[PDB]
């Protein structure tokens, strides 16, 4: 019925972070997730999207994350790893059904990275 | 040889019948499916079959 | 919702972007298309995007 978008804390360059995007539904392996990126004030892009048998990262993302399911939860969380302060975004997640077009858009968590 | 020469002849101006416009882009029909849209180029299929 | 320059563009038998790739209606279709501005209402100053 609804998605919550929580995580997002404050690391640093290089490190790991575990974001969930915990769904409110039955059904939520099959809506498939789609990870977007917005710039702190600039244009909005994507990220990736685990859509069941394979996966589709970004050209910033290529490769350095590991995307994964939790098909027996019906949640969806993304692997960060090789972190960049050039990354620092507000992630986000959506999932649309097959059947009769609906959005279960979220909220969004902060991707802050220091640099040293 | 007059009844010949009309059954000819009607047959004749049947068959270049099929070489006019009627009003269409074209007298071709493929040439009208080919470089209109099908959603309008029903009125040009009309016009020729009319 | 969609862009503003394509309600004019959602109608049957009318080629573009978003009716050929979203939302293609029959050539054959009888109803009746509705829209209205919603400017207030969904944009949003940060940028709804």
């Known amino acids: 019925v609804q998605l919550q978008e929580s995580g997002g804390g404050l690391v640093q360059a290089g490190g790991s972070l575990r974001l969930s995007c915990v769904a409110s539904?039955?059904?939520?392996?099959?809506?498939?997730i789609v990870w977007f990126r917005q710039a702190p004030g600039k244009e909005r892009k994507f990220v990736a999207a685990?859509?069941?048998?394979?996966?589709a990262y970004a050209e910033s993302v290529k490769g350095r994350f590991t995307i994964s399911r939790d098909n027996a939860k019906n949640t969806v969380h993304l692997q960060m790893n090789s972190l960049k302060p050039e990354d620092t975004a507000v992630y986000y997640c959506?999932?649309?059904?097959?059947?009769?077009?609906?959005?279960?858009w979220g909220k969004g968590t902060q991707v802050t990275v220091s640099s040293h | 040889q007059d009844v010949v020469n009309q059954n000819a002849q009607a047959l004749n101006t049947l068959v270049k019948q099929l070489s006019s416009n009627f009003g269409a882009i074209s007298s071709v029909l493929n040439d009208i499916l080919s470089r209109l849209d099908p959603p309008e180029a029903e009125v040009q299929i009309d016009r020729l079959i009319t | 919702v969609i862009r503003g320059d394509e309600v004019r563009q959602i109608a049957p038998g009318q080629t573009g972007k978003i009716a050929d790739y979203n939302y293609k209606l029959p050539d054959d279709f009888t109803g009746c298309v509705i829209a209205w501005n919603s400017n207030n209402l969904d944009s949003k100053v940060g940028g709804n995007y």
């Open positions: 959506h999932s649309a059904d097959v059947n009769g077009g609906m959005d279960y």
């Open positions: 685990i859509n069941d048998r394979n996966t």
């Open positions: 539904g039955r059904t939520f392996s099959s809506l498939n």
